């Protein structure tokens, strides 16, 4: 199964910062090396298994994108599932960003109808904190005027905190199909496992697959998911740092009790008990137990 | 020779490399191959540092828009290397995009090739391209079993068959023209290309262009026909050497002799008339004729033709007076001119007597006896000049 | 059990009797790769380790492994010839200084980057012009000194531009701008651009150059390496560039000297940086010049070829002008069952008139690849970059004919602990083994070599055996009755400074070869024995080692304004601190004599 | 032959864009939009000689690649280039432009040409100047800076040479007093004077001292240049067929006059064209050079049989027929008498009984 994910955007909004960051294991301060991409750089990802993310990594300048509207239109717009389109929120010329961004828009629904866009608005950590919302608002009031051809959602996004995580996360849970039977299985996995939040990443970018947060949650901030990813990523890098996998975490908190455990061959999964009670012990085999019965279901299958 | 077959697509999924046949890597190979749509139809040269690419990119009219049949060549060769390549290139991008017209069959082993040593028993595609890189590797007979699917030859020459016709009518497919399978099923060693038109019931034209097709692809040659007046001498490329492949197959289909002695026979210019002796019977002679039409297929065997070079009512007196009045002097220095009927053959034959043509194009297209230009070659021997060598026509027919 | 294992050394100065000590502390140790080793001051780094030409990890020392001693912080010096080939083209389209200087040069300072060596570096680019004047008078007066005569009557003149004096500096590739910039203004430096007073003047070919002298300029420099003695370089070498084949015409009696000054001490290495190695002995020397061919097979010779396209690889140049039967067919190949004996004997062949006498012998019984010694030579890197020293053991040893035969023989005992009167703070007075060690160490120090306690030591044609048995040291020197008396040669040249642009000051020096069996071995075991003596450091014919120190008073805040940025630099007033406190001074003085009399107060 | 001179680089926000060309505007947008994937190039590409024919001309160029710290992102990526016709030859500019690459890359390494825009002005009258010298002369000698001046020069592009056997004979063709003797090779000032036109490599080998494989690899430099040419050798009992180039004698006029000043005698009148023609087309198999010398008395008259075969063989006129029997079939006589020893009397008398390997004339 593969999704042809496009990544557009104007010349220095930070494309290939975000596709070295997310998927090839990069990190902020080493972004700053990245040399301007020559035209399209065609990335392959196996994300879930079966699944793989073909990424068009297109080269932003003037000269490469007025040959993508007229010579490569056929290549690249062709059978287009998801794209992305990155605004630089620091650009002086936001008004030549929005025509190019309607010739691709025009281009994409001539050429792929179904297809879902995603418009990235970049380097908000250029902007100060207070005035980082109405502005981005500022522009989600345009870009939604403009894109209602096709089904469109903007994310704020840097590269500088989690924000980036966020945006990929809910840029990938589009492309994973069969996403209710995932969030039916950890919903009676935090049912049956008597779990407060249950979450599921993957293995090697660490984008949250699925997630299942129950009312008994002691956990009240709504960007808990892309800061554990950050946080998961970081312990990652540390252990190679020292050559080594990491493979489990638990944790015995004064309320909480978090374990980091492999789930499938593919994802990682956390699981929060809100009961001090209940030993790491009990919870450690309660994982296992529904590992063995997915690895029964997926032998024979 | 080249070194590699390079098969590129290009479409709405990427830039991919689907073969190469000696095992740059290939997402480097497959991004700098592919072209735009724009450069389709034209010749495709491009140099990096030492190796050169040849090819000719053709629109496929699925996921795939562009693809592109590449040769990879060292770059010290000649430009008409790069030339026949380019016509390789393009006749077989022809072929796989009338393949794509009729079946889908580039598509379908691309999509076989992207599924996916092992790789050439499961891909036709890929066995076919190993064909034309060994038929461009080497000099020799190399069957070409990709597809059939559609200048200086004379009405003399005969059409030779390099393999057998009932594997030339297997090959075929059930669409073919009816003008190839009777020109294949027509044909014969000893039977010319005008008695091959005339007996196939087909124009001369369309006779020629099929011969042409055949000798393009190396599954026939042009020569001239058998026959007892032709001499026959060995070759200069031919390879007399006990070890040699081409010896144990004529010893694998002649077990009775050996190759380096019957080539030996043949080592000086002799006839088959010559080879005819009363103690030896016929079925020996129909087996030495056997021999001729096999080492004749693998270019064992040159045929030596007589050539005659010029030196020193009304319209045989415009024709003697074309030329210049020292040679026209010359010629009347020679009493053998004093015959009406000499003086006619003389000036008839003025175009022939320049070297080009041989005796057989002269007997042949002017209908005259051997023996009547022997008679003229002897009445004018002290003007004309008589040599013997191969003839140059025979080495441009050739599987390019 | 290793057989092989390299120590280099760093920013040092390492005597070889300092690096044979060092050798006896790593007699019966096990040796591991990039293993700092220190020794009495001696710091070294074990570089690679060999067993049986393949390179290991860890290994042992047996007393049968030789060690090789690499330096990484060396006096090297680089000449570069500047002949009529340098403003030649190639088979690539590139000037001749174009590919010594852009890729030898640039590829070997990269190299030096990579390996982090820090040497101290000297290059000078050298020529010689021959001028049309047939006579003397032609020529200026104030620079006819350096203006010399040929065998053949033609006058020529020596030209030495020094670029870079002793420097010591990290990034050197920003050196070869400079090197550029002495590549356009070169005509006009060595008066080929008609310089007014003088001749025409026609720079010469590479064969036809000062190759010789330029080695024995640099075997001057090196002869007298104990004068300005640094702590922090070891070894030597001299680096010539040419862009000739490898080809001389020379003097016989100056390759006589320079083989006879090498035999001593053993530095010259030159390369080829025209590329282009031609089909005959390489390093050839055309004698009675400056035919009778010579091959000096101690040149380390080397060859560089930078980058290339598609052909085959040419070795010739090429040139355009400016502009009766069965007796002739016997004499064709003559010096250049029968078929069954003929194939046999064709078969006992396995070098042409050789196979063809045996085919005329046996027959009458029972009735394109390089060749080894025209290879393609590549560049020495290793060489070139660390470059190693001498070798401290020799195995070359004649027969006790070949000592009584040539050599004669004397004698000399040194009884211990009665004429050795050193005093350690008037301790033990210097016993047998450490005057025995010193005495080794005092020979090797000058260049001699051990033959592989009593030990055999040999530098040239004299043999040394110093012998310590049952408390009694001998020393027996061997010297030959034929000695090498060769003669001294008057060199003169025209030199250009390294801090000057275009002046060239005329300079004259003698190459001599220095008398190994003159040297006073008896004062210098006087010197190191006994202690009674001691100004035996003011005989100049033992050649100690010295350096010169000076007290200089620190005036820090002139100096601090100057390098601040300070347009005039005469900001001392009339004297060096001319007031300030003058017993402040006198006092700091008195605590530094203090300290030189190692006095704590 | 080189048509336009181009300079392209990478601008920030904007693609590979076309600075300056030296006849205006040569290139279009459409021909530079065509071929920009091969001009400003993927890093897989950078540093490479990369010459791309396009729509109907040949872009020749070498992008180049400095990825320093203080550029517009990280490097600077610009590309001079030729363009020429799309039938022209254009295998001896490629070291030309690859030359010009390294120049551009040094001359930015050292005093950064190419970042400051008070030296990028300089790049026209250098273009133009490229383009004029280089085209007429083919010799370009262009002070730049204080230390760097560009210099150029075409190679004239040789083809390889074919491997030189031991049996073979060299034949000069270009007049060894037109050559400076004094500064050719010391192994070819040995082997030149024991070339003349009749000796074998092993005979030049042995009258010289010089090794065989160094005579070889010398008589192969020579091919290369094309100062020698390569005949086999010339016993009187050698047996020549003729190719079908007879014909070219007397349809080029050049060569008639090669062979009436090649093949006649020292001292002699000039031969007719018709005894030349005739002693070539006498030549049949079975027939040695001493039949032909008994057969034609008339025409050997003024004319030397030696540099008749001779000039048969170099101009490929005439073919030879060597018998070929190590008895196996891959060496013929000339191999057998080169390796062993034998004359051709010899080996003859050696071979003629031979009932087990039967003679071939391949
Ligand atoms: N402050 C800030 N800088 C960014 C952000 N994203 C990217 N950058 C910087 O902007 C530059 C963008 O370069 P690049 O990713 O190659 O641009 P592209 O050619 O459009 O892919 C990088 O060097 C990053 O250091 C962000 O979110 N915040
Ligand atoms: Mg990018």
Redesign the interface.
Known sequence: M?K?VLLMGRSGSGKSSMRSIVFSNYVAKDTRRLGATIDIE?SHVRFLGNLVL?L?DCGGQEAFMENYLS??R???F??VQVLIYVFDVESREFERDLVTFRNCLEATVANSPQARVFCLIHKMDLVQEDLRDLVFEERKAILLETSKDLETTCLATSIWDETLFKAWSAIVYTLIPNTPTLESHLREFAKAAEAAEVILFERTTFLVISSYSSESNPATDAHRFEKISNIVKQFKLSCSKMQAQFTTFELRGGNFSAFIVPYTEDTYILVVIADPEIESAVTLMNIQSARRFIEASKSAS | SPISVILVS??????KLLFRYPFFSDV?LA??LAT????CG?????????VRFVGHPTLLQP?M?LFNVVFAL???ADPSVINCLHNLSRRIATVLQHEERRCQYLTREAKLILALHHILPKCKLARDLKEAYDSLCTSGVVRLHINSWLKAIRPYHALLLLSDEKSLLGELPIDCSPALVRVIKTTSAVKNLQQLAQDADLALLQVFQLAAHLVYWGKAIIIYPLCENNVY??S?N??????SPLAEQFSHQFPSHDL??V??KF???VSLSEFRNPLAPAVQETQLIQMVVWMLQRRLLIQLHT?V?L??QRMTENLLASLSEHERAAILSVPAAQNPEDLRMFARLLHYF???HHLEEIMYNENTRRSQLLMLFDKFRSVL????????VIAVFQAL | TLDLVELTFKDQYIGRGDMWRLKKSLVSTCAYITQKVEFAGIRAQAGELWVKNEKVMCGYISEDTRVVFRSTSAMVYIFIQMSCEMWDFDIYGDLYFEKAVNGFLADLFTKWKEKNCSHEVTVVLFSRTFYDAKSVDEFPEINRASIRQDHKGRFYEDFYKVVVQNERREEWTSLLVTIKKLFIQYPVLVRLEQAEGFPQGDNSTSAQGNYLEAINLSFNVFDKHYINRNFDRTGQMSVVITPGVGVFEVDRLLMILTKQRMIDNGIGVDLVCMGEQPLHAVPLFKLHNRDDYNIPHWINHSFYTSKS???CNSFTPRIKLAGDYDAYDAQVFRLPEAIQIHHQTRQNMALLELAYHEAAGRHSNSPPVVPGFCCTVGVDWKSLTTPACLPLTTDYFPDRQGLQNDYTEGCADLLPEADIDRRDEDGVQMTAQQVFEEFICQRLMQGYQIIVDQYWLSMGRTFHKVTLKDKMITVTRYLPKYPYESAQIHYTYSLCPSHSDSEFVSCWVEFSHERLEEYKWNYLDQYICSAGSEDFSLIESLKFWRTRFLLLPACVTATKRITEGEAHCDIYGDRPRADEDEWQLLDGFVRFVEGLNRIRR | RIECIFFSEFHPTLGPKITYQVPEDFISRELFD?VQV?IIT?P??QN??????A?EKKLIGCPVCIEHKKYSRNALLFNLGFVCDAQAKT?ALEPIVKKLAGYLTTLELESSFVSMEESKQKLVPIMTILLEELNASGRCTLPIDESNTIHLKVIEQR??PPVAQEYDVPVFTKDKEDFFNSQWDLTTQQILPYIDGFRHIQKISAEADVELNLVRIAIQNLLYYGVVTLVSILQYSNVY????K??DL?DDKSLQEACLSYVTKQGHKRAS??DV??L??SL???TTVRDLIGRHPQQLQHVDERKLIQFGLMKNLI?RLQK?PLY???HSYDEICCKTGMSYHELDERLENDPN??????
């Open positions: 593969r042809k065609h073909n068009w010579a490569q056929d290549h690249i062709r059978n | 290009s479409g709405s999924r990427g830039n480097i991004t700098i735009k749509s724009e450069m034209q010749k495709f040269e491009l140099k990096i540092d030492n996921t828009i060292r770059a010290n001498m060995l200069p031919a390879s007399v050497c006990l070890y380096p002695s080539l030996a080592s000086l210019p050539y070079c030196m020193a320049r070297g080009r000049v008589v040599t013997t060598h191969e003839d140059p | 396209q598609l052909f | 065509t091969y993927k897989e590409l490479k000689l990369i010459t791309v024919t729509m295998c083809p390889d067929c003729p190719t079908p007879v014909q007397v064209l018709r023609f005739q070539y087309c049949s198999p079975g073919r070929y196996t079939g891959c390997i039967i003679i071939c004339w391949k």
